[PDB]
Amino acid sequence: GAMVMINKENLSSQAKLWNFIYGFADSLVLKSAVQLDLANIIHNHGSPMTLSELSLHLPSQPVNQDALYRVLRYLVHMKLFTKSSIDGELRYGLAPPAKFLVKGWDKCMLGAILTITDKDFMAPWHYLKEGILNDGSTSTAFEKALGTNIWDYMAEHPEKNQLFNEGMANDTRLIMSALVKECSSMFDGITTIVDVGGGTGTAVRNIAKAFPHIKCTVYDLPHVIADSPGYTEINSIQGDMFKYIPNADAIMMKCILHDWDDKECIEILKRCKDAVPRDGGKVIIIDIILDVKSEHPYTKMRLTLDLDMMLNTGGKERTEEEWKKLIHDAGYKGYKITHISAVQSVIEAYPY
Amino acid sequence: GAMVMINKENLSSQAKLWNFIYGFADSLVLKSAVQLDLANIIHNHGSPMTLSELSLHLPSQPVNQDALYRVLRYLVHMKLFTKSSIDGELRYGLAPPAKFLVKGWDKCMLGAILTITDKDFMAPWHYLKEGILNDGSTSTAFEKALGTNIWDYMAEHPEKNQLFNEGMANDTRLIMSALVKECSSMFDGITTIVDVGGGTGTAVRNIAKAFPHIKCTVYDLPHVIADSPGYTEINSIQGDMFKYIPNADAIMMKCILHDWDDKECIEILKRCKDAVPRDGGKVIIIDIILDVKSEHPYTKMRLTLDLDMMLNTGGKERTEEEWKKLIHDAGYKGYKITHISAVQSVIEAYPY
Ligand SMILES: Nc1ncnc2c1ncn2[C@@H]1O[C@H](CSCC[C@H](N)C(=O)O)[C@@H](O)[C@H]1O
Ligand SMILES: Nc1ncnc2c1ncn2[C@@H]1O[C@H](CSCC[C@H](N)C(=O)O)[C@@H](O)[C@H]1O
Ligand SMILES: Oc1ccc(C[C@@H]2NCCc3cc(O)c(O)cc32)cc1O
Ligand SMILES: Oc1ccc(C[C@@H]2NCCc3cc(O)c(O)cc32)cc1O
Ligand SMILES: [K+]
Ligand SMILES: [K+]
Ligand SMILES: [K+]
Ligand SMILES: [K+]
Ligand SMILES: [K+]
């Protein structure tokens, strides 16, 4: 018949399953740590704090200190926070990865955390089985969970629109420094650049500051431009990139093409190719490159973004070979990849 | 002013945060793998299967094979499944931890997975912040999310009651073999045993089979006994353990005391102490012992269960010192711990 176990089963193997089952506890404990603002209370204090001292500084009163102690115990085991005995008291501090929970610098990841761990925005992941056994539905998991496609949903839910746009703002803050410094030569000779699907303008505001002689434009759907601050020297245009892309010396698209299937990407890439000059025009794509042959620090979260696209947008994350095919099919002459030690890489696509 | 970064920031540190943010993706991809029954289709086939072969055996038709490929790619990166080139084709197999997703043996963990990753049963974790900043509410996160306390909720939601009771059934299946074999001496001389809060009877059915001369009783709330199969030689009694515990030579409580605060536990433990004989009576507690000094395979999920109790039941997981105090305060003479290489340990509590 079947396998019969006769000696002790491996505890580590079973623990690996329990840790996968409860993966959501890491996401949702982290969310609570962010909502309580623990890392910033400690960082501002400048030294480890007792349970009582932390409690006195929390966002509201009163505080259940038993609950706080037990969440902190979990956070210490995550190696995000520390706990030690100092001068006769137990005090809580920050471990090195907690720096990404500290406000005031480009790699603070708080906006992204609050977007991704939002209850409504997690709901699509419960429809993953229905993405494979689709019973002949063509809708995304986002539509099954929340009623309509992501972008129309954002147009009808202003607070959700804002939360998502700030997550994207954050995502872009993580890479701008590397972009404008390491990839400064990409901006040479450009007099105009349009950020297609540029969101609430983080990328253009940073490019415009680093390169004062380039006239920058942000272009997105009306409900996103409506959630943006006013601009002085930067053009803000609203519209639909499938029907119109503002012409310029260069087009940039960050986290756009991974929202769309290959047919749609080719339509967008053709529209971009015809928006830039034959003479040194270029299209700057910023998106993940999936390595399916070797492992990198961001490999796990890049595969996670592949399914995030599958459920939320209808898109995908692509390997270099897939990018090559898409860029070829849109009729470009060639492409060049630049790594910037980020989740995304830069792919410059060059027309004839 | 503030810290200024001047050299490249650590990619691994940032990846650790992204992996915590997306912890829920591991839980919910695993859920989808269980709903698709991938591990059992492969295990029954007895060799790795192509994407097409897997598709032909899935729970329903048609199948989106792109989606299936991409979920499998994530599952292979989890090291739950494998992918290889064999005789000119890409075939998917099982890695060693996938044995816990295979049906037909005591360590199949499928019931637990489907309980813990259920959408409604995950909802309380979104109210973790409100468990610390409770705005002077005394309700559990379960009540905030789902309307009332867990046990009354189960009484009013028969499908949820069943799903939870089968999760508990599974949890008990994981330990019964070690219990009845390693701890056989605990059952010596006992003529009657009552499993207080014994659920749908897994523990008693297994004890009754291993020890045919012990008259076993399962005792739980009416809506749980109502979700149980009929019994011949095993007594099934319904009631409230805070008002009555059926008298017997021994009482067992598995995953009971971790549902309750210390005052409640002492009330239950006193009721048990007075239900067993002064002459060799004993109370057999099966629950986690938290080690807060060193690390073990199950440490992470035990701390996770501490917050699971905090949110869902109002209880907690306890260290040995906390167990000692509780057992002392209920007026017992002593206790003995037996490890059984499981999530829970056995704590025998002995009256005078
Ligand atoms: N048809 C369309 N035309 C223009 N923008 C669109 C669009 N469909 C979606 N978008 C926009 O594409 C963006 C995808 S999210 C990426 C936002 C930003 N580039 C960043 O990386 O931070 C959203 O802001 C969305 O509103
Ligand atoms: N007042 C009460 N009296 C009796 N049983 C109770 C109770 N309150 C809760 N319970 C039961 O305690 C159990 C906790 S879950 C543990 C179930 C089982 N002992 C196992 O380990 O698999 C549930 O079955 C629940 O219905
Ligand atoms: O920094 C982030 C990284 C990834 C996300 C995931 C997000 N899921 C919903 C749909 C969507 C769409 C996107 O184009 C995108 O770049 C990210 C996401 C949010 C973020 O705020
Ligand atoms: O095997 C399992 C392990 C842990 C759980 C968590 C569960 N959360 C809801 C409330 C609750 C209550 C319990 O008494 C318990 O032992 C487990 C749980 C479910 C399971 O099916
Ligand atoms: K959820
Ligand atoms: K809204
Ligand atoms: K990669
Ligand atoms: K129900
Ligand atoms: K432990």
- Beta strand extents in chain A (DSSP E only): 81-86, 89-94, 192-196, 215-220, 235-238, 250-254, 282-287, 289-290, 318-319, 334-338, 345-350
Fold match between A1-101 and A102-352? no
Residues with Cβ < 8 Å from A145, sequence gap 6 or more? A123, A124, A126, A127
Q: Is B255 annotated as a binding residue?
A: yes
Using DSSP's 3-state secondary structure scheme, residue B194 falls into: strand
- Centre of ligand 2 to C-alpha B118, Å, is 19
Distances (CA, A) of A207 to A201, A312, B91: 10, 29, 47
Residues within 8 A of B (CB atoms), A 273-312 only: 292, 296-301, 303-304, 306-308, 310
β pairing state of B235-238 and B250-254 = unpaired
Neighboring chain B residues of A61 at a CB cutoff of 8 Å: 133
> Residue B65 and residue B309: Cα distance in Å, rounded?
40
Candidates A173, A169, A185, A168; CA nearest to A348 is A185
User: Is residue A99 exposed (0-12), middle (13-18) or buried (19+ Cβ within 10 Å)?
Assistant: buried
Q: How many helices and strands, by DSSP H and E, does chain A display?
A: 17, 11
β pairing state of B345-350 and B282-287 = antiparallel
Using DSSP's 3-state secondary structure scheme, residue A50 falls into: coil
Q: E strand or H helix at A113, and its extent?
A: helix A110-116
**What resolution does the deposited structure have, in angstroms?**
1.6
| A76 interfacial to chain B (CB closer than 8 Å) | no
- Beta strand extents in A170-214 (DSSP E only): 192-196
The DSSP bridge partners found for residue B49 are: B92
Please identify, by atom number, the ligand 2 atom nearest to the C-alpha of residue B165: 24
Residue ranges of the binding site of A for substrate: 171, 255-259, 308
Q: Using the structure block, give the residue that is written with the tokens 């977007």.
A: A115
Is-contact A109 A27, C-beta < 8 A?
Answer: no
Please identify, by atom number, the ligand 1 atom nearest to the C-alpha of residue A168: 22
Is-contact B232 B205, C-beta < 8 A?
Answer: no
Cα dihedral across residues A53, A56, A59, A60: positive or negative: positive
Is-contact A17 B97, C-beta < 8 A?
Answer: yes
**Is A306 within 8 Å of B70 when comparing Cβ atoms?**
yes
Residues within 8 A of A (CB atoms), B 202-231 only: none
> Residue B111 and residue B122: Cα distance in Å, rounded?
15
- Centre of ligand 8 to C-alpha A40, Å, is 42
Q: Does domain B1-101 have CATH number 3.40.50.2300?
A: no
> Residue A348 and residue A270: Cα distance in Å, rounded?
14
Residues within 8 A of A (CB atoms), B 153-192 only: none
Residues with Cβ < 8 Å from B66, sequence gap 6 or more? none
- The tokens for B60 are 């329903």
Candidates B240, B171, B183; CA nearest to B207 is B183
Residues within 8 A of B (CB atoms), A 79-98 only: 79-80, 96-97
Is-contact A255 A168, C-beta < 8 A?
Answer: yes
Is-contact B108 B102, C-beta < 8 A?
Answer: yes
Tell me the nearest-neighbour CA distance from B118 into chain A, angstroms. Answer: 9
Is-contact A283 A251, C-beta < 8 A?
Answer: yes
> Residue B28 and residue B23: Cα distance in Å, rounded?
9
Q: How many C-beta neighbours within 10 Å does residue B42 have?
A: 24
**φ, ψ for residue B84 (rounded to 5)?**
-150, 160
> Residue B340 and residue B285: Cα distance in Å, rounded?
13
Neighboring chain B residues of A309 at a CB cutoff of 8 Å: none
The C-alpha angle B292, B293, B294, rounded to 5 degrees, equals 105
Closest Cβ–Cβ partner in A17, A126, A134 for B100: A17
Cα dihedral across residues B32, B34, B37, B41: positive or negative: positive
Candidates B240, B243, B237; CA nearest to B225 is B237
| B35 interfacial to chain A (CB closer than 8 Å) | yes
**What is chain B's Cα-based Rg?**
23
Q: What is the 3-state secondary structure (H, E, C) of B56-121?
A: HCCCCCCCCHHHHHHHHHHHHHCCCEEEEEECCEEEEEECHHHHHHCCCCCCCCHHHHHHHCCHHH
- Beta strand extents in chain B (DSSP E only): 81-86, 89-94, 192-196, 215-220, 235-238, 250-254, 282-287, 289-290, 318-319, 334-338, 345-350
Is-contact A8 B9, C-beta < 8 A?
Answer: no
Residues within 8 A of A (CB atoms), B 95-114 only: 96-97, 99-101, 104-105, 107, 109, 112-113
Residue to probe by mutation, ligand 2, list B221, B225, B240, most atoms within 8 Å of CB: B221
> Residue A299 and residue A284: Cα distance in Å, rounded?
22
Is-contact A342 A175, C-beta < 8 A?
Answer: yes
Please identify, by atom number, the ligand 3 atom nearest to the C-alpha of residue A109: 1
Closest Cβ–Cβ partner in B96, B128, B306 for A32: B128
User: Is A258 labeled as catalytic in the residue annotation?
Assistant: yes
> Residue A346 and residue B115: Cα distance in Å, rounded?
43
- Residue of A17, A73, A134, A173 for testing the chain B interface, max B β-carbons within 10 Å: A17
Candidates B248, B264, B240, B258; CA nearest to B329 is B264
Tell me the nearest-neighbour CA distance from A352 into chain B, angstroms. Answer: 33
Q: E strand or H helix at B205, and its extent?
A: helix B202-210
> Residue B108 and residue B105: Cα distance in Å, rounded?
6
Tell me the nearest-neighbour CA distance from A335 into chain B, angstroms. Answer: 26
β pairing state of A345-350 and A282-287 = antiparallel
Q: Using the structure block, give the residue that is written with the tokens 């990846």.
A: B15
**Is A30 within 8 Å of B21 when comparing Cβ atoms?**
yes
- Centre of ligand 3 to C-alpha A240, Å, is 20
Closest Cβ–Cβ partner in B16, B61, B113 for A21: B113
Tell me the nearest-neighbour CA distance from B275 into chain A, angstroms. Answer: 32
Residues with Cβ < 8 Å from B109, sequence gap 6 or more? A14, A17, A21, B100, B101, B170, B174
Query: Would you kindly state where each structural domain of chain B is located, as residue ranges?
Result: 1-101, 102-352
Cα dihedral across residues B37, B38, B39, B41: positive or negative: positive
- Centre of ligand 6 to C-alpha A115, Å, is 14
Please identify, by atom number, the ligand 4 atom nearest to the C-alpha of residue B170: 1
Closest Cβ–Cβ partner in B31, B128, B136 for A71: B128
> Residue A238 and residue A218: Cα distance in Å, rounded?
8
**Is A116 within 8 Å of B21 when comparing Cβ atoms?**
yes
Neighboring chain A residues of B116 at a CB cutoff of 8 Å: 21-22
Active site residues of B: 258
Q: Can you name the CATH fold of B102-352? A: Rossmann fold (3.40.50)
Reported for B333-341, long-range contacts at CB under 8 A and 24+ positions apart, including other chains, are B337/B289, B338/B182, B338/B183, B338/B186, B340/B175, B340/B178, B340/B179, B340/B182, B340/B183, B341/A8, B341/A11, B341/B178
Is-contact B249 B192, C-beta < 8 A?
Answer: yes
| B52 interfacial to chain A (CB closer than 8 Å) | no
**φ, ψ for residue B239 (rounded to 5)?**
170, -160
Pocket of ligand 4 (CB under 6 A): B 112, 115-116, 167-168, 170-171, 255, 259, 308, 312-313
Cα dihedral across residues B306, B310, B315, B321: positive or negative: positive
Is-contact B122 B135, C-beta < 8 A?
Answer: no
The C-alpha angle B206, B209, B211, rounded to 5 degrees, equals 105
